[PDB]
Design an enzyme around this catalytic site. Structure first.
Site, PDB file in Angstrom:
ATOM      1  N   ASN A   2      -9.464  -7.171   8.773  1.00  0.00           N
ATOM      2  CA  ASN A   2      -8.718  -6.002   9.193  1.00  0.00           C
ATOM      3  C   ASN A   2      -8.374  -6.161  10.682  1.00  0.00           C
ATOM      4  O   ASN A   2      -9.259  -6.150  11.528  1.00  0.00           O
ATOM      5  CB  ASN A   2      -9.527  -4.694   9.061  1.00  0.00           C
TER       6      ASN A   2
ATOM      7  N   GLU B 138      -4.953  -7.829   7.020  1.00  0.00           N
ATOM      8  CA  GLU B 138      -4.551  -6.421   6.929  1.00  0.00           C
ATOM      9  C   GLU B 138      -4.269  -5.792   8.286  1.00  0.00           C
ATOM     10  O   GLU B 138      -5.094  -5.914   9.201  1.00  0.00           O
ATOM     11  CB  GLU B 138      -5.646  -5.484   6.358  1.00  0.00           C
ATOM     12  N   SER B 139      -3.207  -4.950   8.268  1.00  0.00           N
ATOM     13  CA  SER B 139      -2.744  -4.093   9.353  1.00  0.00           C
ATOM     14  C   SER B 139      -1.979  -4.698  10.488  1.00  0.00           C
ATOM     15  O   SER B 139      -2.362  -5.725  11.024  1.00  0.00           O
ATOM     16  CB  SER B 139      -3.877  -3.379  10.095  1.00  0.00           C
TER      17      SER B 139
ATOM     18  N   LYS C  48      -8.210   2.025  -2.489  1.00  0.00           N
ATOM     19  CA  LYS C  48      -8.543   1.837  -1.077  1.00  0.00           C
ATOM     20  C   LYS C  48      -9.257   3.084  -0.594  1.00  0.00           C
ATOM     21  O   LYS C  48      -8.670   4.183  -0.636  1.00  0.00           O
ATOM     22  CB  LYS C  48      -7.245   1.532  -0.339  1.00  0.00           C
TER      23      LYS C  48
ATOM     24  N   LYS D 131       0.395   4.816   1.014  1.00  0.00           N
ATOM     25  CA  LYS D 131      -0.422   5.607   1.899  1.00  0.00           C
ATOM     26  C   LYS D 131       0.471   6.669   2.492  1.00  0.00           C
ATOM     27  O   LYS D 131       1.560   6.315   2.925  1.00  0.00           O
ATOM     28  CB  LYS D 131      -0.806   4.609   2.982  1.00  0.00           C
TER      29      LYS D 131
ATOM     30  N   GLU E 207     -13.881  -6.448   3.126  1.00  0.00           N
ATOM     31  CA  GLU E 207     -13.275  -6.240   4.402  1.00  0.00           C
ATOM     32  C   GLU E 207     -14.146  -6.585   5.562  1.00  0.00           C
ATOM     33  O   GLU E 207     -15.254  -6.078   5.627  1.00  0.00           O
ATOM     34  CB  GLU E 207     -12.750  -4.786   4.533  1.00  0.00           C
TER      35      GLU E 207
ATOM     36  N   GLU F  31       0.757  -1.223   0.000  1.00  0.00           N
ATOM     37  CA  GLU F  31       0.000   0.000   0.000  1.00  0.00           C
ATOM     38  C   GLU F  31       0.800   1.291   0.000  1.00  0.00           C
ATOM     39  O   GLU F  31       1.820   1.460   0.675  1.00  0.00           O
ATOM     40  CB  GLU F  31      -0.943  -0.079   1.198  1.00  0.00           C
TER      41      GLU F  31
END
Length: 452
Positions: free
Chosen positions: A184, A214-215, A114, A55, A163, A53
């Site tokens: 997530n 994710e994350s 996103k 970002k 998600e 990503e």
């Protein structure tokens, strides 16, 4: 009170309504053509997949990268990603729909938009900007808005990353038939992070669903562990926060590996190209692999690795000197330096230089109690131009600042990478002659490091 999520989504509506004013759908719908990239397809595969990503900022860290250039990010990410995520929320992530085309022109993977998608207009706009996939969130959408939005994406041959952030959402996902579900680990209602979301939720998804975690994914060890729960990862912050992108990438995808005892610039290059993070320069007089300052200067100029100088009970002044002159990233103490030395050394070396301690493992593991030591190198020591220690010994220990060494090579790199350490230290086993690295052995070990 409103959660953070509610607040972002309330602001998105306002952004949507204004944007339609400025660029009504009627003005471009007709010219929006389907995507020619295959999101779903790039995520399917033998290997664990990565969606890297782009970002700039986040709501939980603010500006993450002052230093923001999509095109340059894209240029690096293309060597490793399965897909590329581009944030397009402006207010909370400082992204832009305009970054999509930029990233798309440079990287060939499918590009994922996103954002907080709440209105079909957003989807046509994304496609208009070259996106090949969009994120749809079950925390924001009810089942009928989701079907609708997803039909819109699919109608444009775009893929969807569905998600979920909790159990109820995960059930809905199965029920709605999502082909790619992203777990997530961060809950946007309260910004809290918990990797267990993935651990607990991914397995219920089932073999037919591609699961993306994710994350909060920051280390290679976390990636090896979680890959048994998920088919891939969406990672961004951990990479964005670093000046050197290539390095940041490789750190998470391959581990903090070091290729020790470099004596030629070509070998350093070889190491760098293969994906190594560190290059070791050995200043121990005894070593057949020893280098002097000039020779070091030469090796170093062949590749932008982070060089580590290896010393053995060496004079502090000289250790400091070599650090300053060579611009070493770290110094590795490979003799019997006790705390007092470490302390003085620390007092004398410029603060940007890290201090690493090498320790030899017998039938028992030594303790890692030292103050001022940023990293440890565990090995079956005294160099060895040789062969391995008892890895079962590592269980029960924190290994987040440990590099594994000793006899590491092509033939055993798989097992080694599975022990859970921060990275691996290669030396003799990847050589044709002492101090001379075998580029093919090198490419081979690094290839294995990614085979998961």
């Amino acid at each position: 009170m409103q959660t953070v999520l509610a607040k972002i989504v309330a602001d998105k509506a306002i952004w949507v309504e204004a944007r339609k004013q400025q660029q009504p759908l009627a003005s471009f719908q007709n010219e929006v053509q389907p995507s020619t990239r295959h999101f779903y397809d790039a995520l399917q595969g033998a290997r664990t997949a990565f969606i890297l990503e782009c970002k700039k900022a986040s709501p939980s860290k603010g500006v993450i990268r002052d230093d923001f250039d999509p095109a340059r990010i894209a240029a690096i990410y293309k060597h490793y990603a399965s897909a590329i995520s581009v944030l397009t929320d402006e207010k909370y992530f400082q992204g832009s729909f305009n970054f999509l085309p930029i990233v798309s022109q440079i990287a060939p993977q499918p590009i994922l938009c996103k954002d907080f998608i709440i209105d079909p207009y957003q989807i046509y706009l994304a496609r208009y900007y070259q996106a090949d996939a969009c994120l749809l969130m079950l925390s924001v959408l009810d089942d009928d808005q989701y079907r609708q939005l997803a039909a819109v994406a699919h109608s444009l041959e775009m893929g969807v990353l569905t998600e979920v952030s909790n159990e109820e959402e995960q059930e809905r996902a199965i029920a709605l038939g999502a082909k790619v579900v992203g777990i997530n680990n961060r809950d946007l209602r309260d910004l809290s992070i918990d990797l267990n979301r993935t651990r607990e939720l991914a397995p219920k998804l089932g073999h037919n669903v591609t699961v993306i975690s994710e994350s909060g994914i920051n280390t290679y060890a976390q990636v090896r562990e979680l890959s048994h729960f998920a088919n891939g990862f969406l990672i961004g912050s951990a990479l964005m926060a670093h000046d050197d992108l290539h390095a940041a990438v490789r750190r998470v995808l391959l581990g903090e590996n070091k290729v020790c005892g470099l004596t030629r610039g070509q070998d350093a290059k070889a190491a760098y190209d293969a994906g190594a993070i560190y290059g070791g320069l050995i200043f121990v007089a005894t070593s057949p692999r020893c280098v002097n300052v000039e020779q070091a200067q030469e090796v170093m100029a062949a590749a932008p690795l982070q060089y580590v100088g290896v010393f053995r009970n060496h004079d502090i002044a000289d250790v400091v000197d070599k650090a300053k002159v060579l611009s070493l990233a770290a110094v590795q103490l490979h003799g019997n330096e006790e705390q007092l030395y470490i302390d003085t050394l620390r007092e004398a070396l410029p603060a940007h230089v890290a201090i690493w301690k090498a320790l030899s493992v017998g039938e028992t593991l030594p303790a890692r109690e030292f103050q001022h030591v940023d990293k440890y190198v565990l090995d079956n020591g005294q160099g060895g131009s040789g062969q391995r220690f008892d890895w079962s010994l590592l269980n029960g220990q924190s290994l987040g600042n440990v590099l594994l060494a000793g006899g590491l090579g092509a033939d055993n790199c798989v097992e080694a990478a599975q022990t859970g350490c921060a990275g691996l230290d290669f030396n003799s086993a990847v050589e044709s002659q002492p101090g001379i690295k075998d580029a093919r052995l090198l490419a081979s070990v690094f290839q294995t490091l990614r085979a998961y």
